[PDB]
Every structure is written in structure tokens, then in C-alpha cells.
Design an enzyme around this catalytic site. Structure first.
Site, PDB file in Angstrom:
ATOM      1  N   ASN A 147      -2.951   0.593  12.921  1.00  0.00           N
ATOM      2  CA  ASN A 147      -4.282   1.022  12.671  1.00  0.00           C
ATOM      3  C   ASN A 147      -4.918   1.349  14.004  1.00  0.00           C
ATOM      4  O   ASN A 147      -4.299   1.270  15.034  1.00  0.00           O
ATOM      5  CB  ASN A 147      -5.021  -0.035  11.908  1.00  0.00           C
ATOM      6  CG  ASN A 147      -5.054  -1.305  12.616  1.00  0.00           C
ATOM      7  OD1 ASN A 147      -4.847  -1.334  13.768  1.00  0.00           O
ATOM      8  ND2 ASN A 147      -5.341  -2.346  11.948  1.00  0.00           N
ATOM      9  N   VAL A 223     -12.072   2.101  -1.157  1.00  0.00           N
ATOM     10  CA  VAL A 223     -12.282   1.279  -2.305  1.00  0.00           C
ATOM     11  C   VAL A 223     -13.032   0.092  -1.784  1.00  0.00           C
ATOM     12  O   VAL A 223     -12.679  -0.435  -0.786  1.00  0.00           O
ATOM     13  CB  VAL A 223     -10.961   0.857  -2.880  1.00  0.00           C
ATOM     14  CG1 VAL A 223     -11.146  -0.170  -3.940  1.00  0.00           C
ATOM     15  CG2 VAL A 223     -10.240   2.042  -3.423  1.00  0.00           C
ATOM     16  N   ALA A 225     -13.335  -3.187  -1.590  1.00  0.00           N
ATOM     17  CA  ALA A 225     -12.761  -4.480  -1.710  1.00  0.00           C
ATOM     18  C   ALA A 225     -11.835  -4.710  -0.556  1.00  0.00           C
ATOM     19  O   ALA A 225     -11.486  -3.823   0.151  1.00  0.00           O
ATOM     20  CB  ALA A 225     -12.045  -4.589  -3.013  1.00  0.00           C
ATOM     21  N   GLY A 231      -0.828  -2.742   3.792  1.00  0.00           N
ATOM     22  CA  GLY A 231      -0.078  -2.184   4.872  1.00  0.00           C
ATOM     23  C   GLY A 231       1.371  -2.226   4.647  1.00  0.00           C
ATOM     24  O   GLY A 231       2.074  -1.368   5.009  1.00  0.00           O
ATOM     25  N   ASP A 232       1.811  -3.313   4.097  1.00  0.00           N
ATOM     26  CA  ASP A 232       3.176  -3.529   3.783  1.00  0.00           C
ATOM     27  C   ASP A 232       3.659  -2.566   2.752  1.00  0.00           C
ATOM     28  O   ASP A 232       4.754  -2.126   2.791  1.00  0.00           O
ATOM     29  CB  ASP A 232       3.288  -4.913   3.260  1.00  0.00           C
ATOM     30  CG  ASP A 232       2.861  -5.911   4.231  1.00  0.00           C
ATOM     31  OD1 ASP A 232       3.199  -5.795   5.365  1.00  0.00           O
ATOM     32  OD2 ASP A 232       2.241  -6.875   3.865  1.00  0.00           O
TER      33      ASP A 232
HETATM   34  N1  LIG Z   1     -10.176  -0.637   0.864  1.00  0.00           N
HETATM   35  C1  LIG Z   1      -9.347   0.384   1.002  1.00  0.00           C
HETATM   36  N2  LIG Z   1      -9.713   1.583   0.645  1.00  0.00           N
HETATM   37  C2  LIG Z   1      -8.925   2.608   0.759  1.00  0.00           C
HETATM   38  N3  LIG Z   1      -7.724   2.504   1.243  1.00  0.00           N
HETATM   39  C3  LIG Z   1      -7.221   1.357   1.642  1.00  0.00           C
HETATM   40  C4  LIG Z   1      -8.031   0.198   1.542  1.00  0.00           C
HETATM   41  N4  LIG Z   1      -7.324  -0.794   1.994  1.00  0.00           N
HETATM   42  C5  LIG Z   1      -6.149  -0.294   2.358  1.00  0.00           C
HETATM   43  N5  LIG Z   1      -6.102   0.990   2.165  1.00  0.00           N
HETATM   44  C6  LIG Z   1      -4.952   1.847   2.428  1.00  0.00           C
HETATM   45  O1  LIG Z   1      -3.921   1.108   2.969  1.00  0.00           O
HETATM   46  C7  LIG Z   1      -3.555   1.576   4.228  1.00  0.00           C
HETATM   47  C8  LIG Z   1      -3.290   0.385   5.088  1.00  0.00           C
HETATM   48  O2  LIG Z   1      -4.420  -0.415   5.043  1.00  0.00           O
HETATM   49  P1  LIG Z   1      -4.377  -1.814   5.596  1.00  0.00           P
HETATM   50  O3  LIG Z   1      -3.062  -2.052   6.058  1.00  0.00           O
HETATM   51  O4  LIG Z   1      -4.924  -2.724   4.637  1.00  0.00           O
HETATM   52  O5  LIG Z   1      -5.338  -1.617   6.753  1.00  0.00           O
HETATM   53  P2  LIG Z   1      -4.795  -1.422   8.170  1.00  0.00           P
HETATM   54  O6  LIG Z   1      -5.950  -1.408   9.000  1.00  0.00           O
HETATM   55  O7  LIG Z   1      -3.748  -0.463   8.351  1.00  0.00           O
HETATM   56  O8  LIG Z   1      -4.080  -2.770   8.272  1.00  0.00           O
HETATM   57  P3  LIG Z   1      -2.594  -2.810   8.695  1.00  0.00           P
HETATM   58  O9  LIG Z   1      -2.055  -1.397   9.035  1.00  0.00           O
HETATM   59  O10 LIG Z   1      -1.737  -3.441   7.802  1.00  0.00           O
HETATM   60  S1  LIG Z   1      -2.443  -4.183  10.084  1.00  0.00           S
HETATM   61  C9  LIG Z   1      -4.709   2.362   4.711  1.00  0.00           C
HETATM   62  O11 LIG Z   1      -4.364   3.396   5.604  1.00  0.00           O
HETATM   63  C10 LIG Z   1      -5.180   2.896   3.432  1.00  0.00           C
HETATM   64  O12 LIG Z   1      -4.257   3.855   3.034  1.00  0.00           O
END
Ligand SMILES: Nc1ncnc2c1ncn2[C@@H]1O[C@H](COP(=O)(O)OP(=O)(O)OP(O)(O)=S)[C@@H](O)[C@H]1O
Ligand SMILES: Nc1ncnc2c1ncn2[C@@H]1O[C@H](COP(=O)(O)OP(=O)(O)OP(O)(O)=S)[C@@H](O)[C@H]1O
Lengths: 309, 309
Positions: A147, A223, A225, A231-232
Site C-alpha cells: 500500500n 466500502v 467498513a 490484502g491476502d
Molecule cells: N473498505 C474497502 N473498500 C474498498 N476496497 C477495499 C476496502 N478494503 C480493502 N479493499 C480492497 O482490498 C485491497 C487491499 O486492501 P487492504 O489490503 O485491506 O488494504 P491495504 O492498505 O492494501 O492493506 P494491505 O495491502 O494488506 S497491508 C485494496 O486495494 C482494495 O482493493
């Protein structure tokens, strides 16, 4: 047949780590050898959690069990959340050995360290891991999905604009991985504050020996929430779709993100259903509706379009 | 949705225990909370293997982690191979508590204790569990899937004919479970020595308040190879199809056995392909082609017909 070695956490209930990675990869046609780095009752976002953690030495034993039977042969390697530096070092050793054994092997790595809460950036992983990821892991990775905060940590540079973000992604390319996706960022979107911006960059080889970097940008609905395991899941589906689309990061990211969006939209709907009307859903009610999204994961309806820069 | 608590083994590579149960159940629409009773590199049929075993105390803690979060709510419970008496007693305690919480809960139990090699019968499990299974587990079970040898062990009487087999199954019905399926046996088949006989029995309450026992028989072709995890898969798919067909053991077993047939046919095909022409495939090459059979597991083409006795 495409085999993926996925070394991630395991939860009895919910979808994080391997629970969020095995099912989609299997439904998408990948054999998955899964090393569960932990066995917890649920993810740590809950009020409580109980379980055990696999030691790095135990991880080594498992890998040696596979090696002795001459089955330590893989096309991909997938990793994510780890808090143990030694375990990360073990993973790097394993990846190096497998790459000696197979030069075509692809290491997909989600370098999990922290995220930006509000405008502040905060790490939820021990600090002594930042060097490791930067000096030992990412150099051996082929796809990384950080990220913005993680990108900044790895590059040592803060990102204030999209051009700075792609400069950082070029730095990350130089560190090792030919494919880099910044999953989330605090960059503004052209549609409003309800959309999130993600960028992608893939450097590809030319006939003359030169290399071209293809850059793409995506805007996604947010979204409302906090989800865990996203991420996984994102890294698993990106692995699959980049495998089918090795020269088209645009299409791979479009499919991946659409599938995420579908999963999250269904999850937030069912979560607000379980909770009272106008009530904050709990982490338990926000667990990803993975099973109920099988078809969406198999062949997602495209709902986001990436702009090629 | 329908949630299943599956307490079984986990292998990094291959399909036994939870690896053979989670994917089919999830593909069939069931949420699955999985407790990995062990983590090994591969099943013991290989030349070598390494891993770790979950302690009963650890199992208790995982269950308590679920309970503390008010998440220990389940529609089914699924178990299989266990070598530890205390672990089985822990499982029985958990089933008792869940049934106190929900009288509609269905406990599907594969009482794995041994099988018949050639004509001789041999046990894979410590003897001190046979009392346990007979006195503590089966009494609280609702569906059991033993083989001829295990049914004989539980009933204490040897089976020499189909009528004797159904007498043993009536005894098992008396011990607890209203559905009993003997998955394999040494009974002859009218179609040849290459057919295996499976029998089923379900006690069902009638509208008049009385109870009728439905019995069925299945003849299935042997595939000439030794597979591992087939019992686990069988029990998982039987759970699914009995959920879909609670009053039709005939259809449930037909679907279950057809899926098994498809899976095993594909597995032997690909295993003989991997091995040289006219070469016996190795345990590694005989791992179930689980992913590649997804569709057959979702909606199996009926290839066996069960005769209602
Ligand atoms: N609340 C949300 N709304 C929209 N998309 C989300 C949301 N949460 C996660 N995502 C999607 O999931 C992907 C990864 O999100 P997360 O992994 O939860 O956030 P992140 O900041 O990448 O954390 P990482 O990569 O795991 S450490 C994002 O690029 C979005 O595609
Ligand atoms: N060699 C085979 N040929 C045909 N079908 C098989 C074969 N092996 C397994 N199966 C199928 O899978 C089921 C196998 O059950 P088994 O694994 O034999 O049960 P078991 O080994 O007898 O003992 P348990 O307690 O069930 S693990 C059978 O009922 C068949 O459906």
C-alpha cells in the site's frame, strides 16, 4: 497444472491468510500447497483470539519433508503477514532455493507492515522487519502488492502525488520485482472522496534487450467498513489473473479489483443484514462472504476500468 | 448459510482430512470453520513426512476462542482420523455443548480405526480409542461412515453376509446415529469382483409418529490404486448431499458416490499419465485431483444407481 506454495496464517473461522488465499486459487484452477504460519481461532480484529504460532524451525521441517520426497517443485510462491523476522528469513531462503531449482518461478509478496489510519501512518509489525523486507525479501520478489505506506517505508520516500508514486514504484522495480501494485493510497480521485485510487506498474522485456514500463491507474468505490484479509485475497487473485494475462497488467488488475469489489459489496450487505438496521457491524459480521462469492471470483463482472498512462 | 465445524488433519501437500473436506464443502455452499488437528508435509503413504500435532489443550483453546466471541454456533460437526484419546474426548465435549446450544445440530463422524487388507483386518489407531468411539462418540453422532471392519469393531460382531451387515447397522442405529453408511466392504457383487459394495441405512420418523428404516445398496467399480483421503472426502460430500436430501438417502449416496467415482477416475488417469506407460504411479502421483474435479463435485453426473431394499 500450476502449483502455488502459500505460506500464510490460518484461522479456524474467517478468511485471512491462507483461508483467504486457498479457496480462490483452487476455484481458479491452481494446486495450492499451504503452510499455515499460525492457527488462531479468528483474526486479531476480534475482541479476543486464541491459538498457536508456527516456529521458523517448524516451517523448515515442513519444507524439508517436501524436499526429501522430491515434491518441493512450484511455479509460484505466495506470502503475506508475518511478525517473526526469522520466519521471513526462512521464507527468503526457501524462495532462493526454489529459484535455483526453477528460473521461471514467480514470488508474489504482500509486504505487510502497516497502513495509514486517517492521515497518520502506523506500523503494526515489528520495526526490525522493515530492513528485512527491503534488503532480503522484496529483492527476491517478482510481484509485490504494497500500500502507500508500505511503499513509502520500502523506498524511504513519502508520496505526495501520482508522479511521485510512480517514481517510488520505479524505485521498487529497481529493487527487484517487475510487477508492482500499490493497493491503496491517499491520492485524490477524480470522482470524489468515496473512491480510492490504486496504481500498477509492470516492466517488460523488449526484443532489442530494452525494457518498457506499462503504468495503469484505477479508481474503486470505497466500502464503509474495515475488512480483514482483503490484502491476502487481493494478492491471490492478482497472482491468478497475472498468470492468465502475463503481458496485460490492465486486464489482470481489472479482474482482480472487480472480484474484490463484488466480494466486499456482498459482505457489507450481508453484514448490515445480520446487524440491526443502522447498526455498526462487528468484525465477526464483516467476515468476507467467500463461499457465497465463488462465481464472482471465477469470472468477475468487470465493474472497474483501468486507465493506461 | 450452513456452517460446519470440521476438526481434521492438514497436509501442506495433498488432500486428506481438512484438505479433502474444506474445498468440496465450500464449493457446495457451506461455510467451514476448520480446526487442523495436525500439520504434516504430506500423508504417511509417502516415503517421508514431517509435521506437528495439535494438543487437546490447544483444541480446547481454539474452541474457547470461538466461544468467547459468541461465534461457537454451528449447524454441523465433522470429524475423522484421530490417534489421541484425550482429543476425541475433547471433541465429544464440544459436540455435547454445541448440541445443548442447538438441538438441530448434526454430528457427522467417520470413525476411523482400521480397514481390511486382503481378507485380514488391521487397525491403524491405538486400541484405547475403540471403547471411546463406542461409548462416547457414536452415541452423540448422527451420521457415521464406517467401513466393514470398523462397523464390526463397533458392534463387536463379525459380518459374513449382507443381512448380517444390516443387523450390525441396526445395532449402530441403536448406539446413536440415525444414518449409517458402510462405505466399503468385502461382500460380493453381482457384476464382478471389481465392484465394491456399499450399504446405507437411515431411520426416519413417519407422519404417524412411528419410524421406518430405509436401506439401500450400491455397487461401485474398484479403481486399482490405493488412494488416501477418500474417506474424508466421502464423509464431507455425504454431509452436503444429506443436507440437500434429508429424507432421501438413496439420492444423497448416489450423488456422493458418483462424485467419488468421477474424482477417482480422473485421479487414476492423470496418475498413470504422470507415471511412465505401464508404470505403477507413486503415492505422490495418486493425490486426488481435487481442484480439477470441482465441477464434478458441484453437480455430479449420476453413474451409480442404489437399489432400495
Ligand atoms: N473498505 C474497502 N473498500 C474498498 N476496497 C477495499 C476496502 N478494503 C480493502 N479493499 C480492497 O482490498 C485491497 C487491499 O486492501 P487492504 O489490503 O485491506 O488494504 P491495504 O492498505 O492494501 O492493506 P494491505 O495491502 O494488506 S497491508 C485494496 O486495494 C482494495 O482493493
Ligand atoms: N479403490 C477404490 N475404488 C473405488 N472406489 C473407491 C476406492 N477407494 C475409495 N473409493 C471410494 O471412496 C470410498 C472409500 O472409502 P474408504 O476410504 O474405503 O473408507 P475406508 O478406507 O474403508 O475406511 P474409512 O473409515 O472410511 S477412512 C468408497 O466408498 C468409494 O466411494
Amino acid at each position: 497444472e500450476c502449483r502455488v506454495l502459500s505460506i500464510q496464517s490460518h484461522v479456524v473461522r474467517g478468511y485471512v491468510g491462507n483461508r483467504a488465499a486457498m479457496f480462490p486459487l483452487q476455484v481458479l484452477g491452481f494446486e495450492v500447497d499451504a503452510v499455515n504460519s499460525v492457527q488462531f481461532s479468528n483474526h486479531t480484529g476480534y475482541a479476543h483470539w486464541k491459538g498457536q504460532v508456527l516456529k521458523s524451525q517448524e516451517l523448515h521441517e515442513l519444507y524439508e519433508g517436501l524436499k526429501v520426497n522430491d515434491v518441493n517443485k512450484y511455479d509460484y510462491v505466495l506470502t503475506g503477514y508475518t511478525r517473526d523476522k526469522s520466519f521471513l528469513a526462512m521464507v527468503v531462503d526457501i524462495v532462493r532455493e526454489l529459484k535455483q531449482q526453477n528460473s521461471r518461478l514467480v514470488y508474489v509478496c504482500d509486504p505487510v507492515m502497516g497502513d495509514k489510519w486517517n492521515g497518520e501512518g502506523s506500523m503494526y509489525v515489528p520495526q526490525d522487519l522493515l530492513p528485512v523486507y527491503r534488503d532480503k525479501v522484496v529483492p527476491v520478489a517478482d510481484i509485490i502488492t504494497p500500500n502507500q505506506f508500505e511503499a513509502e517505508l520500502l523506498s524511504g520516500r513519502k508520496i505526495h502525488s501520482q508522479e511521485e508514486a510512480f517514481e517510488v514504484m520505479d524505485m521498487l522495480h529497481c529493487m527487484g520485482p517487475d510487477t508492482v501494485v500499490i493497493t491503496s493510497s491517499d491520492l485524490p480521485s477524480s470522482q470524489g472522496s468515496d473512491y480510492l485510487i490504486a496504481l500498477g506498474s509492470q516492466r517488460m522485456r523488449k526484443p532489442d534487450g530494452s525494457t518498457v514500463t506499462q503504468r495503469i491507474r484505477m479508481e474503486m468505490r470505497k466500502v464503509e467498513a474495515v475488512f480483514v484479509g482483503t490484502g491476502d485475497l487481493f494478492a491471490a487473485m492478482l497472482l491468478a489473473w497475472t498468470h492468465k494475462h502475463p503481458d496485460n497488467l490492465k486486464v489482470a488488475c481489472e479482474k482482480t479489483v472487480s472480484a474484490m469489489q463484488h466480494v466486499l459489496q456482498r459482505t457489507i450487505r450481508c453484514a448490515k443484514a445480520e446487524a440491526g438496521e443502522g447498526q455498526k457491524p462487528s468484525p465477526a459480521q464483516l467476515e468476507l462472504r467467500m463461499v457465497q462469492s465463488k462465481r464472482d471470483i471465477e469470472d468477475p463482472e468487470i465493474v472497474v476500468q483501468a486507465t493506461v498512462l
